[PDB]
Design a protein around this ligand. Structure first.
Ligand SMILES: [Ca+2]
Ligand SMILES: [Ca+2]
Ligand SMILES: [Ca+2]
Ligand SMILES: [Ca+2]
Ligand SMILES: [Ca+2]
Lengths: 347, 347, 347, 347, 347
């Protein structure tokens, strides 16, 4: 994730110009290889046309260039690319909203799971750790960065997310399917045990805990669903072929022809297809942004900071339910007890 | 479902190029017959024009080719196809989200339906099986793959989803309408019996069970609604006719005319309508993706793995509420009891 | 509603071709009169131009035809029609989702309203009948088919949805506004009476009943709101005028001119405006689909089966809360008590 | 609001033609002045060109007309207008859904706030009146029609929505911000008093009342938010300037030039720019529909019937919670106690 | 925020014309510098072409102008800008809906946290202040205006949102991540203390408080998420480059060429590219509106009134839960105890 929200807080004269000088998370970083390859093939064709081909071969090549320039428009590149990129961007923001956060659960656990003794601390810390462990299991399932951090369950145990007893129980469970849900069932069992023990003082508090756990588990499941149900491979194939075929057609049809031949709209030889290069930049860049966003759990610059989120979620959850439990400042009268650096349209 | 999420985790130089070599779930698999038929009709017309027709018939055919090339644009193929495909894709993802999953219910049942004895196991297993049975009944109603797996209720009974006593009760119910809802009413009755028996310890836990059951039943009902209320047949007819009429017009108007006649934009005979074939590829491919996605419960490669989901849901539900009930590891102090391989914009 | 979900489960070679032979719910059924009228006016103009007008009148008519062909593009038909049809289709699916279904309520009532005696049966049947009666009142308010079935409240009483005592109470209520909500208030009162009587065993069950009743009543209200707040009449007028004006312009500008006059793009007289007819087919068909979908509660083929839904909802509700109450098969150990015909991306 | 849902229930031969004869809520009513002004300026320019200007001034004017006709396309009128109108229409339907309705609250109050005595009637009537008063305060804040009906709080007191004691409390509250929320806080306090008094029999019923009150208050707040956060003024300015500049360009570039000069596409003088007038009709009409819908709380024909809704909501709420409380017909066996004028795809 | 809802309540003859005279929140204010710079570069190029370049250099410049005019269309400016602006506007309204409001919480607190004594006042005021403090912490994290108002936590303490004891607890918490959530955990702890003390009278009221707190905290978290996950920098770079490259191309290709050279569509020298300036106005204005809306928490005229909202929320919350607690007017019979200045389609 490359944040630039601060840089664009106010609409200024050089508003988006200053963002063109960024390299991390940039279009240039994602596209310089493809742009160089396109320019290389174009210059190879241009050198062949200018120096290698005979006069008759040049006339045939010019006829082919005009044909491919005219009929390259029949490729619905804008049509297919717009649809695909809209679908990918919607999925991208939806997938970010699907990452499970323990904030709701840590508020509820701090409010509902009671006891200053070691057992109360154990209950609160274990509930938040089960939530974190479910998040880690699904994230290492769906995120290449989290997988590289946790390539085995041994790594997850060594990171403190899973104990060795919990590891024995987890691997002893006979299932061929993804086990990210297992800590959520542990959470439900532990919440029921805590309520039966009296650590949870009422049935409504237990109901709230289970509702927030189900929201968290739904988010983990939704991450699994987005990972499994890819954007239909046929859409990806079609848009990739559309871009490739259109730009091979442009490699042919955007060549500068000899202005001595008096071909219409062919009288200025600039030797470098500046607009064709800009059109490639924009269209191939759009597809590269979809390429980068299609799996936002990879290791691209604008991919989600999944490992940062794991560390932040674990630290904040443990702070919220252990350090901060029943740790209020004494109720003190505020500044305005005895009270800087629009009403409506029809009034 | 053909997953390729891993292959596109990072935006790489050969980003989407390597996905063009896939055959399962590909555009080539869905479109090679239609592409061959279009090319066959085009080559039949081309052979007739080149070898069969007389000179006067050739001049008339060339006038007709230019007319059909000019006025084939009056068919709003892009207009109708874009609308249709957007509607189908929205319905497709909505329909995937509508498939009932027992994860919420199995978390709640593991947390709320109590007893290590045989009767507690029976209650939890039976509640999850009623949920699974409702899912199976609606899925065999809406999915051709699940129907082929369960062509009779006898098959469902033999698969263990329905008992023989439950089969007698189910067929003895006098209703001409789809009975997928019957196990949900069984679930409500059984949850009430469990609460009255004391297996469910509080009224709030029963309320949570009934709320999650209603979410599950709503998902089953929504699957029935999507199966019943098709994309309006008039849209499907209109887009099919648009594609067919446009490409028959192109079969006429994209023919290569004799360059000796000096027709404008007709001076290069390539004998194979490469761009017209690419345009057919993209437009007919878009319609074929809508064709494949319009009923995502068929047996296409990118159709949902409904039978896999049935097996996974049943196995995971039975694991969650029977093997995993009250089966926590002893509460153990974690690694950070005494504590790898952004703050904001305005700071 | 014309369902064809089964016919398109798999993407086949003749995928959407076989749906072009359907007549019920077809574009041909909605559009053959308009297509015939357009063709009749076109042939009247063509016959006048070919046989009636003098040479000077023919030259003036040809100038007018070229003018109207050129400047008919200034009508934003695609612009206005796309916006309108998207709005109508969104409203159409939203309106289908707004039809009240008693499935949630019948699950809750079967789970919560207790007693095998006649009084328990009366309570459950009466609650589901109040829900059904609210649905019938709003549906006869908004649906022409349901109104034809229930043109008076006498018809509703004779159908068993309302008793005669309830009819006296209903007509004795002094209100000039639609009374579809009245049975929902009866439902709330009856649920409170049932809870006070002990038929509902707990306050949380009563709360769940009232929440599901409010969901049902919200759906009835939303149906009233969609019926009242039409698609803005100005949009309907604008799109109707756009289609009509554009196709009158085409009636003028698509005429085949005498090829002897050597007008550019006028040298092939086909005597039948095949593409213009296809363009009319697609554009007028799009507007006709919006026409049919704009009120999905009429008697069009693809309009909702409101009377079928009323009968199904009543029968299934009465089955669920009367026949099926506390009527479980004895808890029996399933087949897998002692256990046919993907893990993640990063693994 | 101009309802025409009934007129379009069935897709008929003269489907949308009969709606073109409506004047109330019509495009003609909103656009006849602008259309007359555009036609007046066009005819002034036409008369100047035909009668006033000299030959050289005519040649210069013809060059300018051709220039402005060619380059008027550079104005993205379709681009900006489509975006703006989609945003306005989405906000319009969202704003209609945001109008608070007391139906949920009146169902809950009839079910939960008990007592046939005068005090129970007072509690139910006062709770529904607080809801109605919050609706009236925000509506007179946001709606010009409701403001004209209630230009002072004295008017609201005289209408029975606020008592004089409540008026003293309301004006004695020291706040510079909109006080529409005040009756909602009164509602919360009164609901707590009713529960403490035993009129509300359980804590879950009080929780349901407060949840429905918060839904109602959220709707009032959302109306305030939509009134405050206008569609960004820069969008409105940009689209207004786009329409105005484009049609001034058309006032220049759509002039009929002397056909004797042999200008291409200028050989038929119709003296009335029929298509240009139709294009103005459609584009300016689209902007006028956005103009009318942008504040749907004004006094346009298709603006919401806010005063009708206030009267209906008050009357129906008072009927529901006072006349209809505990006023059921005796539980009577229905017609089908001893039982007119699709199963699935894969079956 | 520049509200103009009142000015457009009714669709009037001069409907949007009168909004073109506004300067605050206007397109002119955001765009006059860019428009002046574009016009300056254009006039520099025009002066060079008219006075400086030789005849041969003029002929080459004219060839380049025609080339750049023809092929500037290959830049998908409309394509990329439409996508970007739609994404930004959706995020903009979503971000406005994500600003936490204490209205739900103040209704619940006034209804549920009891006691007229000093301790009850302290509990209610402290709960609302914790909510306000969470809002302030996240807003100074995400909003430049709120940061300028609260550049240190010392400023927040001096404003009365945080006490000094709470400041000691807040800074003593060991966390490297944003601490906006801390007051929400304080809220959960304080609500639990209030329920345990008997100030909250029932467990369902505590559950409602925690649910509304979690809604509030979710809104604060969502503000953090929108601030962190910017619109992908690659989209911003691509659209900025598209606008810049297209308008540099227009700086070249929109130059008025010497009409003596008889270049087609170059025969009228207006010396000022009025349409090109209008096209720049619209396209650059669209991008400037996205620039202004992309971070709606800056100090632009149409940016959200975050400091006004902070002051309003604090004042209204303190009014609602302190002044207005248990402060009803005596239950009085309303005006219509003994009862001005549509039924349905199918009736
Ligand atoms: Ca990625
Ligand atoms: Ca399929
Ligand atoms: Ca209809
Ligand atoms: Ca209005
Ligand atoms: Ca800003």
């Amino acid at each position: 994730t490359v944040t630039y929200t601060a840089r664009v807080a106010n609409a200024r004269f050089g508003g988006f110009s200053q963002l063109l000088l960024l390299w991390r998370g940039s279009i240039y970083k994602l596209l310089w290889r493809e742009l160089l390859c396109f320019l290389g093939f174009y210059m190879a064709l241009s050198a062949a046309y200018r120096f290698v081909l005979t006069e008759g071969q040049k006339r045939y090549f010019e006829k082919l260039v005009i044909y491919c320039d005219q009929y390259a428009s029949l490729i619905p590149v804008s049509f297919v690319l717009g649809f695909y990129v809209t679908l990918v961007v919607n999925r991208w923001w939806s997938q970010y909203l699907c990452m499970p956060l323990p904030d709701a659960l840590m508020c509820v656990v701090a409010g509902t799971v009671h006891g200053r003794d070691d057992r109360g601390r154990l209950y609160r810390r274990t509930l938040m750790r089960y939530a974190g462990l479910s998040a880690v299991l699904i994230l290492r399932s769906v995120s290449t960065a989290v997988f590289k951090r946790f390539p085995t369950i041994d790594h997850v145990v060594e990171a403190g997310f899973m104990t060795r007893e919990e590891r024995k129980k987890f691997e002893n469970l006979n299932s061929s399917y993804n086990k990210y849900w297992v800590p959520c069932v542990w959470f439900s069992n532990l919440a029921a045990q805590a309520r039966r023990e009296g650590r949870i003082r009422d049935n409504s508090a237990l109901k709230l805990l289970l509702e927030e756990l189900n929201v968290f588990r739904g988010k983990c499941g939704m991450l699994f669903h987005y990972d499994w149900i890819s954007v239909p491979l046929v859409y990806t194939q079609v848009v990739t072929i559309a871009l490739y075929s259109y730009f091979l057609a442009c490699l042919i049809g955007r060549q500068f022809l000899d202005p001595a031949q008096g071909y219409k709209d062919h009288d200025l030889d600039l030797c470098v297809p500046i607009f064709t290069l800009l059109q490639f930049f924009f269209y191939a860049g759009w597809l590269k942004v979809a390429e980068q966003l299609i799996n936002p759990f990879g290791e691209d610059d604008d991919d989600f900071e999944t490992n940062f989120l794991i560390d932040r979620n674990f630290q904040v959850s443990m702070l919220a339910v252990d350090e901060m439990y029943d740790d209020l400042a004494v109720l003190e009268k505020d500044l305005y007890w005895d009270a800087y650096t629009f009403q409506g349209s029809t009034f």
